[PDB]
Amino acid sequence: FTPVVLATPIPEEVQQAQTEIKLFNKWSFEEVEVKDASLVDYVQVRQPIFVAHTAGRYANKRFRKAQCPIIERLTNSLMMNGRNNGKKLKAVRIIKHTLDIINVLTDQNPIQVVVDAITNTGPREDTTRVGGGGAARRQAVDVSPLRRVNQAIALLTIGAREAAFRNIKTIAETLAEELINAAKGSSTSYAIKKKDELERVAKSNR
Amino acid sequence: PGVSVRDVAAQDFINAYASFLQRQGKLEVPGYVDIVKTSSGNEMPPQDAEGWFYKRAASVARHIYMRKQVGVGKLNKLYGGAKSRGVRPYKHIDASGSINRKVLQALEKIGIVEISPKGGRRISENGQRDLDRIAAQTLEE
Amino acid sequence: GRVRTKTVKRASKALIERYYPKLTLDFQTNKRLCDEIATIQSKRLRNKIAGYTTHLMKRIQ
Amino acid sequence: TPVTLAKVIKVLGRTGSRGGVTQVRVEFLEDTSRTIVRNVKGPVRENDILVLMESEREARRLR
Amino acid sequence: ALISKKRKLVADGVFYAELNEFFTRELAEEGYSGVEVRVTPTKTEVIIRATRTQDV
Amino acid sequence: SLVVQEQGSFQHILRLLNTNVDGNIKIVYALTTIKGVGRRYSNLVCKKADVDLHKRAGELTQEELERIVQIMQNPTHYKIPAWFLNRQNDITDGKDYHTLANNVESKLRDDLERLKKIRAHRGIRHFWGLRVRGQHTKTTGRRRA
Amino acid sequence: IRRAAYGVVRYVMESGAKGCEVVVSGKLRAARAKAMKFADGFLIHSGQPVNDFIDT
Amino acid sequence: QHAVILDQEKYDRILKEVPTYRYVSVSVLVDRLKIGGSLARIALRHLEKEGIIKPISKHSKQAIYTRAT
Amino acid sequence: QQQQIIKIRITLTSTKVKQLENVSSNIVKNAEQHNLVKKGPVRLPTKVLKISTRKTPNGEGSKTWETYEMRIHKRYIDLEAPVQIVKRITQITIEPGVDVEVVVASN
Amino acid sequence: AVPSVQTFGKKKSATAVAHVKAGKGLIKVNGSPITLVEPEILRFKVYEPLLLVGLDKFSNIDIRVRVTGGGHVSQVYAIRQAIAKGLVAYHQKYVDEQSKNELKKAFTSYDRTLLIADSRRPEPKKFGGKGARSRFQKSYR
RNA sequence: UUGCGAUAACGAACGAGACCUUAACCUACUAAAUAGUGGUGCUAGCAUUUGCUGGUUAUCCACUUCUUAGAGGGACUAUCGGUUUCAAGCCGAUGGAAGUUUGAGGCAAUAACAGGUCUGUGAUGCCCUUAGACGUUCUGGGCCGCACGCGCGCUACACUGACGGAGCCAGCGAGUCUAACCUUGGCCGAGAGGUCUUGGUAAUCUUGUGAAACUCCGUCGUGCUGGGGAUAGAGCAUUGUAAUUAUUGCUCUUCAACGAGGAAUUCCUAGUAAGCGCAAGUCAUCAGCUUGCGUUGAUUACGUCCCUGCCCUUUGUACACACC
Numbered sequence A: 001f002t003p004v005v006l007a008t009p010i011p012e013e014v015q016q017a018q019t020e021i022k023l024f025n026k027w028s029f030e031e032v033e034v035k036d037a038s039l040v041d042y043v044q045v046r047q048p049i050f051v052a053h054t055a056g057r058y059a060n061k062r063f064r065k066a067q068c069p070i071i072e073r074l075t076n077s078l079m080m081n082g083r084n085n086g087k088k089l090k091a092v093r094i095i096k097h098t099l100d101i102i103n104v105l106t107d108q109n110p111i112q113v114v115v116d117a118i119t120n121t122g123p124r125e126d127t128t129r130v131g132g133g134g135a136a137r138r139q140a141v142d143v144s145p146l147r148r149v150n151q152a153i154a155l156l157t158i159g160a161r162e163a164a165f166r167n168i169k170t171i172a173e174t175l176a177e178e179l180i181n182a183a184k185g186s187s188t189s190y191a192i193k194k195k196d197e198l199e200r201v202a203k204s205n206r
Numbered sequence B: 001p002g003v004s005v006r007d008v009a010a011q012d013f014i015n016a017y018a019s020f021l022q023r024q025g026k027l028e029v030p031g032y033v034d035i036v037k038t039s040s041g042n043e044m045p046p047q048d049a050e051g052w053f054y055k056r057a058a059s060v061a062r063h064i065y066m067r068k069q070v071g072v073g074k075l076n077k078l079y080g081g082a083k084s085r086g087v088r089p090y091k092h093i094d095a096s097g098s099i100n101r102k103v104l105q106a107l108e109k110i111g112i113v114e115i116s117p118k119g120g121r122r123i124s125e126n127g128q129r130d131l132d133r134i135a136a137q138t139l140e141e
Numbered sequence C: 001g002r003v004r005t006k007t008v009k010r011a012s013k014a015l016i017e018r019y020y021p022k023l024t025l026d027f028q029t030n031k032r033l034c035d036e037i038a039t040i041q042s043k044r045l046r047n048k049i050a051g052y053t054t055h056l057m058k059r060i061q
Numbered sequence D: 001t002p003v004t005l006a007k008v009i010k011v012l013g014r015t016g017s018r019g020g021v022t023q024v025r026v027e028f029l030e031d032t033s034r035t036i037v038r039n040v041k042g043p044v045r046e047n048d049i050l051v052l053m054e055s056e057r058e059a060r061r062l063r
Numbered sequence E: 001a002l003i004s005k006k007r008k009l010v011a012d013g014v015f016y017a018e019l020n021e022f023f024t025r026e027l028a029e030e031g032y033s034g035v036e037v038r039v040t041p042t043k044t045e046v047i048i049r050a051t052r053t054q055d056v
Numbered sequence F: 001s002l003v004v005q006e007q008g009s010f011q012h013i014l015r016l017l018n019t020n021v022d023g024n025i026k027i028v029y030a031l032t033t034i035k036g037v038g039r040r041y042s043n044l045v046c047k048k049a050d051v052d053l054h055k056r057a058g059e060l061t062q063e064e065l066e067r068i069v070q071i072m073q074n075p076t077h078y079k080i081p082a083w084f085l086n087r088q089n090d091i092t093d094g095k096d097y098h099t100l101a102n103n104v105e106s107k108l109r110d111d112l113e114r115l116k117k118i119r120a121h122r123g124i125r126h127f128w129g130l131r132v133r134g135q136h137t138k139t140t141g142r143r144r145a
Numbered sequence G: 001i002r003r004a005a006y007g008v009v010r011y012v013m014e015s016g017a018k019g020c021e022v023v024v025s026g027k028l029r030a031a032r033a034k035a036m037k038f039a040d041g042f043l044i045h046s047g048q049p050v051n052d053f054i055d056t
Numbered sequence H: 001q002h003a004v005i006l007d008q009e010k011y012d013r014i015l016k017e018v019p020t021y022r023y024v025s026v027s028v029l030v031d032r033l034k035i036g037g038s039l040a041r042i043a044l045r046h047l048e049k050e051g052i053i054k055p056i057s058k059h060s061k062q063a064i065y066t067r068a069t
Numbered sequence I: 001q002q003q004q005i006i007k008i009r010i011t012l013t014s015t016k017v018k019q020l021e022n023v024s025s026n027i028v029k030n031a032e033q034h035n036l037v038k039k040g041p042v043r044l045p046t047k048v049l050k051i052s053t054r055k056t057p058n059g060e061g062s063k064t065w066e067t068y069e070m071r072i073h074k075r076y077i078d079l080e081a082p083v084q085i086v087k088r089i090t091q092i093t094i095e096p097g098v099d100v101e102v103v104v105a106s107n
Numbered sequence J: 001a002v003p004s005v006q007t008f009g010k011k012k013s014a015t016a017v018a019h020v021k022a023g024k025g026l027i028k029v030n031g032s033p034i035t036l037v038e039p040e041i042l043r044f045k046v047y048e049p050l051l052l053v054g055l056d057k058f059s060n061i062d063i064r065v066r067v068t069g070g071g072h073v074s075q076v077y078a079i080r081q082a083i084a085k086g087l088v089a090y091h092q093k094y095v096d097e098q099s100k101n102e103l104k105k106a107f108t109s110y111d112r113t114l115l116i117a118d119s120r121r122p123e124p125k126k127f128g129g130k131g132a133r134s135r136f137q138k139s140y141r
Numbered sequence K: 001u002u003g004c005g006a007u008a009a010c011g012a013a014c015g016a017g018a019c020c021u022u023a024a025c026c027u028a029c030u031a032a033a034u035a036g037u038g039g040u041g042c043u044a045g046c047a048u049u050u051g052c053u054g055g056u057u058a059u060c061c062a063c064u065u066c067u068u069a070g071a072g073g074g075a076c077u078a079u080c081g082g083u084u085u086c087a088a089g090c091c092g093a094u095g096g097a098a099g100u101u102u103g104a105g106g107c108a109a110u111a112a113c114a115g116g117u118c119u120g121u122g123a124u125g126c127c128c129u130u131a132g133a134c135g136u137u138c139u140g141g142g143c144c145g146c147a148c149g150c151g152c153g154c155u156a157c158a159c160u161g162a163c164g165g166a167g168c169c170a171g172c173g174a175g176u177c178u179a180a181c182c183u184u185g186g187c188c189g190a191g192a193g194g195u196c197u198u199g200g201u202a203a204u205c206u207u208g209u210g211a212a213a214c215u216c217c218g219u220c221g222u223g224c225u226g227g228g229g230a231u232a233g234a235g236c237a238u239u240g241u242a243a244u245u246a247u248u249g250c251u252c253u254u255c256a257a258c259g260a261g262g263a264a265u266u267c268c269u270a271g272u273a274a275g276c277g278c279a280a281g282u283c284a285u286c287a288g289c290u291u292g293c294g295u296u297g298a299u300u301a302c303g304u305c306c307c308u309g310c311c312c313u314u315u316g317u318a319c320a321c322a323c324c
């Protein structure tokens, strides 16, 4: 709880992160308590990290990607559509800017908001093609909690990538608007709109 | 407490060191500025255009400081980039070799680099002193 | 993907037949005394033989 | 909509035409040991907690 | 003789492969089975594995 | 080495060198509307004419327009280094001319009908409407040209 | 060919080898080509011991 | 379409309405005032010097700014 | 002719490592019994000569390739040798398949 | 002479050699402090060996790291390994073992690559594709 | 067809596997100025009071962590739980450099196909020609010719982006006197390139291949726009006996479609896809190509027979040049 002097001097804001590990230096991984269970053990909080870059292996087993942190899994769903393949330095830079904007409006915890997004745009009832042809029937299945996390990260980040495309608004703030709208539940986010499309199909495909 | 030019960030050093030689003004900026692009792989000339030769010389003299010898050909390969060949894919093209040779001959006459019998330019007695002063300035400004 | 060939399992079973009051439930000494009581042409071959043989004792107890 | 969280007891096997549907046996968290069998689209595992928008329907596709 | 080791080893591998086919053709009816070239200073000696040596 | 402000004493769409050069866009990118004057040529002459490059081309004073065009029509006077132009060592008088707005079509025709008139093969390919720079016509250009 | 191949196969076996195989392909008074293996003994076809033990 | 010069009547609601903005950026001034990004950038650097907005990030390609107090 | 160090280096280049390190061992064993000081077998990086050809002689089939590899292994041993007795015991039994060069220097 | 250990850290091709010896808090990378690393968003990878245990465990120690090979992210993950391995190897040879095994607890309980080199290696490209697995597009028509 | 098990079979052989190569570990050995590190024999600088340096191995000494490559060791799913017929196995956890055949290749049986190659060979039978030649050689043209259909690609439709500056980091090769190869440095030139020298037959020199995406700071600001660079004009170089139908590069100008793509269709399960570029091959010159190589590095599943293809068993047969 003290400042330390070294021959190569360390700044004080990083020296204050000695007492708690936060996102990048700013937002704690504590009080990110998830109001909806069944996604706990699949939203990966309760292990703090500093930056959302980790070269960790999580795709060599069936469920190791449930232990990749939920901010790294959000950065992961950004760096695609070819021209952005590779480039996690750009995707981590976005989420640093994104969690700023999530903190500025609706001034609460920006990690809690992206967690509130994943628990809100996870598709709880989906459908599958029963019958092995084009002229078939569709059946209402329940959805795995890993898939509800898997699709929610996909639905939010696609709706960020679409809305930031071809306009002045940045990927930093479209995603921030995507996650804030999804945190409330508003039908003005892409991911909530796409989720209720999946769920109204399964009401009728029972 | 004795500051070298490694304790200061390279972006913040070169901006400070370029504005020093600009406000001092003895660098003999060669005359063909605003007609040159700094590389064949470039589309445009430098976008600041009253400047950029103070910045190129600040980056060269820093690069001489870090290294032990740098010549012109190593300097062109340094500042080259991806050349858009239009419809064929990109490539590395070395930078302009008359700009960087007239950077080095400029820093010689103001005493920063010299002839260095293992190649091209090593940084001088005085040039090491000159960059080290600015490095002392930059941490506490 | 870890099923063992007959040449591992015959040589393991032929070791148990005539060297039970010898080599024990430890792989490491089983690895090392197959150097003396068997002529095995490869280090990778010896360790698979010594490991199934170790697996066999743990079943025998 | 009165949803119910249910707790996986057994992964009874894959079903569906392509194998992408896994049939599981769950017990409800509220009023526990009220055990039924459901279909799951994503990767389901033992002791996963998953949510049902209906309380009276058992999975019918198998083998 | 001022030639690289990547080149001097390949050129000796070509001088071997040329005499292999030359002695295949010339010593065909005398039971040639192989040639063995030993690169020594001041002489190289060509060892011919011919089964009926007495007419070679 | 710092950022300074500005103010908008502004003039819209403006004829220049027989081209409706636009306002609301910057000086070296409003003068790319003029044929024969591209980006490198705009950037060199908007520095030779002592014009601030951030002026948005409609805050430009009407005498600053006149120095811009006087440099364009006459570049070898004002130390543009004669490798920077369209037509150099021209075809008939050997002198370097930067060809401008309506004249770049005119000298294009003058090049193409010089070339047919000697029955040169590139002029013949120019007459037939084929590609003239040694392409492969078998696959490409197969909805137009 | 059957007298030549079994002549050299059973010369190899009587000279002390583990395996031998003679394969003759071509045409012999018939237009359509056929191949017949004259194999006696024991061969190993896969792996490094092809390089260790087999003369081809 | 987007004002690339700055006359007075845009100036007196740049200085009146960037107060009550929670989030201010280049694109925030583009889509809610009606200037271009090259004047939104100028209206960012000017307005932090006047101190009615305070910086948070100050990255190139993305500036996060917010209302003072 | 009287026991003077000559600062000789024997470089040994060969495709096959077992025959190469046979002579590089014997150069060590010869100079450890004349009590000569030596920098030992310095193992230079293996030159790998790779040649990629299409498998087929014509142009038919799937696009299948070989990589034919020649490995060159090389060593050198530095010596400081009384020349007449050491040149007597080095020029004898030159190894085929191993190329050996002997260089003296004035340092 | 001085109590000194020398370790290394390794990503794909980036090998950071650390020369850890007794001193006064010095933490340097290739000539330069830990405060300026480039990429400046990956600054906290090379602060995780410092912050997980506290700065006070580095106050008696000089660390002088040379990294070459690899790339910009890849060198960063070798820096955080070279000095987390350098501090532990200093707490093996000189400081107590119970104090060494708190270092190896909190390093491993956060990030296993802080001490143990990741074995993911470049799988070779195969003919018939631009990739190791990926194949050229086939036609049928 | 890997085994376990059932068993009129028992016990084996080829193939699979083992094997060989490559990659990941070795602070354990053997060392090295053709690799480094540490002092400093010894200096010598800059700021200082030790931080960053530059220099000499009978004009030093020591060490091998880093690198190399000899010889070895390591992993055998080890250990422990769960399931299985307590099998063969499989899954999870812990340890571990590695727990996907450890990753990846090389090798790869029996049987074939009327698969391709006579235009790779002085591999070859038969046929054709053999001087007015289908031989050989010389000069010029052609393969590239353009209403068009198809295949693999390269460049994009932009703000997760272009430009300018700045930061600046790999790995696999190759290279000349058995003659003009890789080229550092200096000078001249916007550039392309030229000239004077140099080092290297190569862990020694090019070369730290200072590679590109990337990062930061500026300029742009949703406009077919500063995206895109197709077409086209003018000039300067290089290679070459020879550049015209532009060999290629360079500087200015022209700035086309293209606003993410019907029907359909390809590849792909972890350092893998994808983005990025570098070397080699052919090469005098020419890469949007291929073989590698490294940089950046995700989504999704650890399943199935639904589509397609293949395999095995049962049934049918009037088929055995075997549904051609």
Ligand SMILES: [Mg+2]
Binding pocket: B073
């Ligand atoms: Mg040069």
Ligand SMILES: [Mg+2]
Binding pocket: B084, B085, B086
């Ligand atoms: Mg070009």
Ligand SMILES: [Mg+2]
Binding pocket: D014, D015, D016, D017, D018, D019, K304
């Ligand atoms: Mg099924």
Ligand SMILES: [Mg+2]
Binding pocket: G019, G041, G042, G043
């Ligand atoms: Mg046999």
Ligand SMILES: [Mg+2]
Binding pocket: G044, G046
């Ligand atoms: Mg076998």
Ligand SMILES: [Mg+2]
Binding pocket: G046, G047
């Ligand atoms: Mg095998």
Ligand SMILES: [Mg+2]
Binding pocket: J130, J131, J132
């Ligand atoms: Mg790829």
Ligand SMILES: [Mg+2]
Binding pocket: K064
């Ligand atoms: Mg070692």
Ligand SMILES: [Mg+2]
Binding pocket: K114
């Ligand atoms: Mg055929």
Ligand SMILES: [Mg+2]
Binding pocket: K114
């Ligand atoms: Mg046929």
Ligand SMILES: [Mg+2]
Binding pocket: K136, K137
């Ligand atoms: Mg002739």
Ligand SMILES: [Mg+2]
Binding pocket: K143
């Ligand atoms: Mg052709």
Ligand SMILES: [Mg+2]
Binding pocket: K151, K152
């Ligand atoms: Mg094709």
Ligand SMILES: [Mg+2]
Binding pocket: none
């Ligand atoms: Mg850039």
Ligand SMILES: [Mg+2]
Binding pocket: K208
């Ligand atoms: Mg390198």
Ligand SMILES: [Mg+2]
Binding pocket: none
């Ligand atoms: Mg345009």
